[PDB]
């Protein structure tokens, strides 16, 4: 058996949407012990859906300017973040991760169509891989905002967003930003 | 089951060898220890009261790994990141004197031998003391 962090298992983790199912990783043969793998996943197109989505949450968390190469900093932020999820919920935190991802990526987006100087967006459809890509970005960004200038830890404030999105609650940052992009799109239609 | 220094968590090995040298009691402590930095690239004086011992303990450890180090190489060893004000940062070495009288104090305990090839190596008595401190950490770890 291959436990993430030696203590979290994968066979419990259950994907709801078939839309996201082939574009969200670890269930069975993607199961790896650490997020850090360092493989060429952006060598050509549609290879970054085969990398483990904990490593996806890693690589989008080193993202800011002062943190911009420090991956072992980040897989430590991840490791302490799952164990705060488990102590607040008791669920396998990978399931909480996936239930926070699915509820986060929007499903219709606006797009500017027309000549320059004319702003008339039309709603289009959101790709499944982009809905993965949009959600992780919206998840990581909410960890920065409520934890840039206060006592709370980013290994902690990540776990407060990644729980509040698996509720689909209004308290999460990645939910309000889905409730805007997909609110604006249905006024563009 | 013969333990060695290398078979042990190293930053606890240093914490064990440090408190060994206070309990030995005989180690020449300079009188400036209450006063001074360890380098020019350090902001403040080090926090630990007994910092001389753990830096003595660190020094004997590095001699066991490679024998033949001088005073300058030990000043290289505890080197750091000089934050050059609003100019960009660079590497700065330690202090030569704290690196000197550490090697000079542990030479007084017949732990440190001065070499044919210039520097200072570790006496076979000093190799006994490390591997006995190494037992005291390996036992307190694997049996607890």
């Amino acid at each position: 058996d291959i436990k993430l962090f030696g203590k979290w298992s994968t066979d419990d983790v259950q994907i709801n949407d078939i839309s996201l199912q082939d574009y969200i990783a670890v269930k069975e043969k993607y199961a790896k012990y650490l997020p850090h793998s360092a493989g060429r996943y952006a060598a050509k197109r549609f290879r970054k859906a085969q990398c483990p989505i904990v490593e996806r949450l890693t690589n989008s968390m080193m993202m800011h300017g002062r943190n911009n190469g420090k991956k072992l900093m980040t897989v430590r932020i991840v490791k302490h973040a799952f164990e705060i999820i488990h102590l607040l919920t008791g669920e396998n935190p990978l399931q909480v991760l996936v239930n926070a991802i699915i509820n986060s990526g929007p499903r219709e987006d606006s797009t500017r169509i027309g000549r320059a100087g004319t702003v008339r967006r039309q709603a289009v459809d959101v790709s499944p891989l982009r809905r993965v890509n949009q959600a992780i970005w919206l998840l990581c960004t909410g960890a920065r905002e409520a934890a840039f200038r206060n006592i709370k830890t980013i290994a902690e404030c990540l776990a407060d967003e990644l729980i509040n999105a698996a509720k689909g609650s209004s308290n999460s940052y990645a939910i309000k930003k889905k409730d805007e992009l997909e609110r604006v799109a249905k006024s563009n239609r | 089951p013969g333990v060695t220094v290398k078979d042990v968590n190293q930053q606890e090995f240093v914490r064990a060898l440090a408190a060994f040298l206070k309990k030995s009691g005989k180690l020449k402590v300079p009188e400036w220890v209450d006063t001074v930095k360890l380098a020019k690239h350090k902001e403040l004086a080090p926090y630990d009261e007994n910092w001389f011992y753990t830096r003595a303990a660190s020094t004997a450890r590095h001699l066991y790994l490679r024998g033949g180090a001088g005073v300058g190489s030990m000043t290289k060893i505890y080197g750091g990141r000089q934050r050059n004000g609003v100019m960009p940062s660079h590497f700065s070495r330690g202090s030569k004197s704290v690196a000197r009288r550490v090697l000079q104090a542990l030479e007084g305990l017949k732990m440190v031998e001065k070499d044919q090839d210039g520097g200072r190596k570790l006496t076979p008595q000093g190799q006994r003391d490390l591997d006995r401190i190494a037992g005291q950490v390996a036992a307190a770890n694997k049996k607890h």
């Binding site: - | 009188e31 400036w32 209450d34 006063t35 930095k37 902001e43 403040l44 004086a45 926090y47």
Partner: protein
């Protein structure tokens, strides 16, 4: 930790108000003349626990910390840690503190201006003293 009842929230040292609830290795710095580096060596000659807060202490600890600050060479504090190394009028080593250092920067300014040195004119003119390009920077505060 615990709840001390002889915890002065407000210290009054050298006419300077020291926040008692701060760590005492960083509440001495609240006066002029003393930074971080000198205050640690003051407290280690006083043999007072660096872990403890500034309001937590007695009076006899406080006034002997004052005494070691006033008279540093007596307590074997070296002469290179000193605020004013060789004062030109007397050649005397001291550490100069809050109302004194305020009073004794004026003495160096009234020296170089009365002598009409180059730096003395700079301070009289308000300009850059250490030999700096004034073409581009140091703009703000003019009309």
């Amino acid at each position: 930790l615990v709840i001390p009842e002889k915890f002065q929230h407000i210290l009054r040292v050298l006419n300077t108000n020291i926040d008692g609830r701060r760590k005492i290795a960083f509440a001495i710095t609240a006066i002029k003349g003393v930074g971080r580096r000198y205050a640690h060596v003051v407290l280690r000659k006083a043999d007072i626990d660096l872990t403890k807060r500034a309001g937590e202490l007695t009076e006899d600890e406080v006034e002997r910390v004052i005494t070691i600050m006033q008279n540093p060479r007596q307590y074997k504090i070296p002469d290179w840690f000193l605020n004013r190394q060789k004062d030109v009028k007397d050649g005397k080593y001291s550490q100069v503190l809050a109302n004194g250092l305020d009073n004794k920067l004026r003495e160096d300014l009234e020296r170089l201006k009365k002598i009409r040195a180059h730096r003395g004119l700079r301070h009289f003119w308000g300009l850059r003293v250490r030999g700096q390009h004034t073409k581009t920077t140091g703009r703000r505060g003019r009309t």
